[PDB]
Amino acid sequence: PTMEGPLRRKTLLKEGRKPALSSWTRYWVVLSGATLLYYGAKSLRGTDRKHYKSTPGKKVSIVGWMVQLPDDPEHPDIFQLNNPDKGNVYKFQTGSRFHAILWHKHLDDACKSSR
Amino acid sequence: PTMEGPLRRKTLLKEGRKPALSSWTRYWVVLSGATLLYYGAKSLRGTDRKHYKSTPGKKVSIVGWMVQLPDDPEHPDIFQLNNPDKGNVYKFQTGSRFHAILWHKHLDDACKSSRP
């Protein structure tokens, strides 16, 4: 894998419309090639790999997607991810600005890879 | 900084001898150049950067130190750090094998890097 770590994701737009409720969801996320694999939480607290499931609940290719880093002091650990038509848009919390920068780098490489 | 993250540290040896008391302590650790800066936890809730203090509690140069990855299925998220004479030895829990490998990479470079 290129990158792994505990992330919280919030859906801002799905199929071009705002979800009724856009709350944060805890996941262990693995970026393998240009594919994101998401592992749901086993409990309500914890950020170690063991606090998340063994089988992925979601698998998404991000080839051609776009990732952005907002440089927002109010939310220092966030990055945003959008599919090509910007109909599916997500924000991710990483726990720190450093990890937001690190994820942005690897995600940007993946979005721009050919496949 | 080259690397940052929440780590738990345990001291195995200090000045060549096992400490009387030893346990896992939570820290936000920042590798800046060849220096590790440690920020203790503000409270009991400690995963995000904001859960740790703003002023560092420890500052340690690791130039000439050695870091090791044990490849131990029993403790997949551990890496060990040793000072030059191996009198000060620590183990660190990172939460995942992936982060243990990542920290090892950056620490190994730092141990072979420059002194200010």
Side-chain angles (χ1 to χ4, degrees):
Chain A
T2 294
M3 182 60 191
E4 298 197 27
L7 296 178
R8 283 95 72 171
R9 196 185 76 173
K10 177 184 286 190
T11 299
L12 299 191
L13 283 182
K14 182 176 48 186
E15 292 189 278
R17 59 141 49 189
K18 307 180 182 174
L21 284 192
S22 60
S23 56
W24 295 102
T25 299
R26 295 163 54 240
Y27 293 104
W28 181 264
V29 176
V30 173
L31 172 67
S32 177
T35 299
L36 290 178
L37 299 310
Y38 293 81
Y39 299 83
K42 286 181 179 170
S43 62
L44 294 171
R45 185 180 187 179
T47 49
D48 285 9
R49 177 62 183 91
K50 67 187 191 68
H51 296 132
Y52 299 89
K53 293 172 178 174
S54 288
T55 172
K58 299 173 186 61
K59 180 172 162 179
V60 180
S61 174
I62 60 177
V63 169
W65 285 38
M66 175 186 292
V67 62
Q68 303 165 28
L69 262 184
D71 183 82
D72 184 341
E74 174 165 41
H75 307 281
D77 62 328
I78 286 171
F79 66 83
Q80 186 175 303
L81 187 64
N82 336 286
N83 71 342
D85 77 351
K86 309 188 83 171
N88 285 3
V89 178
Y90 311 88
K91 270 175 179 171
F92 284 88
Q93 289 182 329
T94 69
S96 67
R97 170 72 173 182
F98 178 82
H99 283 261
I101 290 163
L102 183 56
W103 274 97
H104 169 267
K105 156 57 178 175
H106 292 307
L107 289 169
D108 193 62
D109 291 353
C111 290
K112 294 171 182 167
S113 66
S114 51
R115 139 143 281 198
Chain B
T2 298
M3 183 57 194
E4 298 198 28
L7 298 177
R8 275 96 65 171
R9 194 186 75 173
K10 178 177 184 187
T11 299
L12 297 196
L13 284 183
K14 189 178 165 188
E15 292 186 279
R17 73 113 71 60
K18 182 186 178 182
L21 281 69
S22 59
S23 61
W24 291 100
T25 301
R26 295 175 303 124
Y27 292 107
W28 183 263
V29 176
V30 174
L31 171 67
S32 181
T35 299
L36 290 178
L37 310 166
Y38 294 79
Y39 299 86
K42 279 176 185 173
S43 63
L44 299 182
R45 180 95 181 299
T47 188
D48 295 3
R49 175 63 184 90
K50 67 184 179 190
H51 296 321
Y52 298 86
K53 291 167 186 181
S54 61
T55 176
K58 283 186 271 299
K59 174 167 176 179
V60 180
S61 173
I62 61 176
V63 173
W65 284 39
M66 174 184 326
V67 60
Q68 308 165 184
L69 274 179
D71 183 68
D72 186 335
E74 177 165 40
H75 305 290
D77 66 319
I78 294 297
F79 66 83
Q80 184 173 299
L81 185 62
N82 320 291
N83 72 342
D85 73 355
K86 304 170 180 168
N88 282 27
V89 177
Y90 313 86
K91 271 172 179 179
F92 287 85
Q93 295 180 327
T94 67
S96 72
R97 172 69 180 182
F98 184 87
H99 285 254
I101 289 172
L102 182 53
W103 275 98
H104 170 266
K105 171 186 66 176
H106 289 300
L107 289 166
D108 188 69
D109 291 335
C111 291
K112 300 168 189 176
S113 72
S114 57
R115 271 205 178 77

